[PDB]
Amino acid sequence: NPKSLTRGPRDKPTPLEELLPHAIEFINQYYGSFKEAKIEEHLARLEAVTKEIETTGTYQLTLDELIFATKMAWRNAPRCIGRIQWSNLQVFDARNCSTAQEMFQHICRHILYATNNGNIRSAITVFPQRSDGKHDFRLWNSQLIRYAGYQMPDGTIRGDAATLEFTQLCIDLGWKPRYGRFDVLPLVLQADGQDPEVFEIPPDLVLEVTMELGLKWYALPAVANMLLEVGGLEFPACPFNGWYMGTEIGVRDFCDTQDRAVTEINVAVLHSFQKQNVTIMDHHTASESFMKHMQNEYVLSPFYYYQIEPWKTHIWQNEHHHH
């Protein structure tokens, strides 16, 4: 019975008999948060939602339903440690986005809001929902901000190892590669199912913490490649962020070997972020964010799914050669 954590592509609208039960169930969860209140409201919404699905083949969530969904999907994230304070999420509604250029601006706003000069704020930007599956909005990046990974003659790394495929893809799409250890990758944005466009991220928007010893690391951990599922609807483009734990900062840029044995700690990170006043999940933050979460108080659906890397499934039109 274990379920797949991946939700792949489609090439035709979700059939009605499949969509309705899911929509109906979401509307129930949504109105369920309200105990005995809003029963007539609940029924009026089902009628409206059903009417829409039967006439248009789909339906639109209300801003409040969307907000509830992004938070419930966060709450339902099994491995997420930050889900403990799921109410602390800022939602940016970009469901009326049409072009990659507009996606770029929305992402710039997201990065700008979330970074907040170091006082990290959790946010998610929701782009248009999947229609027929041929007009998907997708961010090809794994994260909004990430360093490039360059292959070396001897088989070693220079940059972030985890971005080898993507880094190469950027170069193939026209992007000019500098060969440093900390090159922020550009945004590869796909709008309405079209070929992706490359956009350099304005340097000012990228806040970095200085760890020669020789190291830096961006302050904003933002997942750009997941799919939000809610009531049968799928959102292939919905970048979100939180703040680092401190343990994980992928310094896989290494020969860094520079007790028992496996004693390479995560100390200078904990302190460097704190002294540069950038939110990290230390005890203070865990306690404070839980407090903020508690003050707001006064299969699994919705859910964040993984996807098949877009370059592996994209039906190229013509643009940018050596795809």
Q: How far is the CB of 183 from ligand HEM (least distance, A)?
A: 22
Q: Is 297 a catalytic residue?
A: no
Output phi, psi for 52, to 5 deg.
-65, -45
| Contact set for ligand HEM, span 78-107 (CB under 6 A) | 78-82, 89
Q: Is 260 a catalytic residue?
A: no
CA–chain centroid gap for 148, Å, is 18
CA–chain centroid gap for 212, Å, is 34
Q: Is 150 annotated as a binding residue?
A: no
| Contact set for ligand HEM, span 285-304 (CB under 6 A) | 304
Q: By CB under 6 A, which span of 32-40, 46-54, 75-83, 126-134 interacts with ligand HEM?
A: 75-83
321 touches ligand HEM (CB under 6 A):
no
Calculate the dihedral angle through the C-alpha atoms of 220, 98, 142, 204, rounding to the nearest 10 degrees: -30
3 touches ligand HEM (CB under 6 A):
no
Q: How far is the CB of 47 from ligand HEM (least distance, A)?
A: 30
Q: Is 305 annotated as a binding residue?
A: no
Residue type present at position 296: N
Helix (H) or strand (E) holding 63: helix 63-75
Of 12, 18, 2, residue with least CA distance to 231? 18
Instruction: Kindly give, in sequence order, each residue whose CB lies less than 8 Å from that of residue 115, ignoring residues fewer than 6 positions away.
Output: 205, 207, 219, 220
Q: Kindly tell me which of 20 and 224 has the beta carbon lying closer to ligand HEM.
A: 224
Q: Is 243 annotated as a binding residue?
A: yes
Residue type present at position 67: I
Binding mask 265-284 for ligand HEM (x = CB under 6 A): ----------------x---
Helix (H) or strand (E) holding 44: helix 39-56
Q: Is 79 annotated as a binding residue?
A: no
Q: How far is the CB of 273 from ligand HEM (least distance, A)?
A: 12
10 Å CB burial of residue 138 (0-12, 13-18, 19+) is buried
124 touches ligand HEM (CB under 6 A):
yes
Q: Kindly tell me which of 53 and 226 has the beta carbon lying closer to ligand HEM.
A: 226
| Contact set for ligand HEM, span 187-226 (CB under 6 A) | 226
How far the first Cα of the chain sits from its last, in Å, is: 38
Give the angle subtended at the CA of 297 by the CAs of 292 and 303, to the nearest 5°. 90
Q: Is 80 a catalytic residue?
A: yes
Q: How far is the CB of 282 from ligand HEM (least distance, A)?
A: 10
Asked if residue 125 lies in contact with residue 92, where contact means CB atoms within 8 angstroms, the answer is yes
CA pair distance 90, 222, nearest whole angstrom: 14
Q: Kindly tell me which of 74 and 199 has the beta carbon lying closer to ligand HEM.
A: 74
Q: Is 80 annotated as a binding residue?
A: yes
Q: Is 255 annotated as a binding residue?
A: no
Asked if residue 206 lies in contact with residue 108, where contact means CB atoms within 8 angstroms, the answer is no
Q: By CB under 6 A, which span of 17-25, 74-82, 106-114, 258-266 interacts with ligand HEM?
A: 74-82
Asked if residue 26 lies in contact with residue 232, where contact means CB atoms within 8 angstroms, the answer is yes
Q: Is 248 a catalytic residue?
A: yes
Q: Which residues bind ligand HEM (CB under 6 A)?
A: 70, 74, 77-82, 89, 122, 124, 226, 240, 242-243, 245, 281, 304
Q: Which residues are catalytic?
A: 80, 83, 243, 248
Annotated binding site for heme b: 80, 306
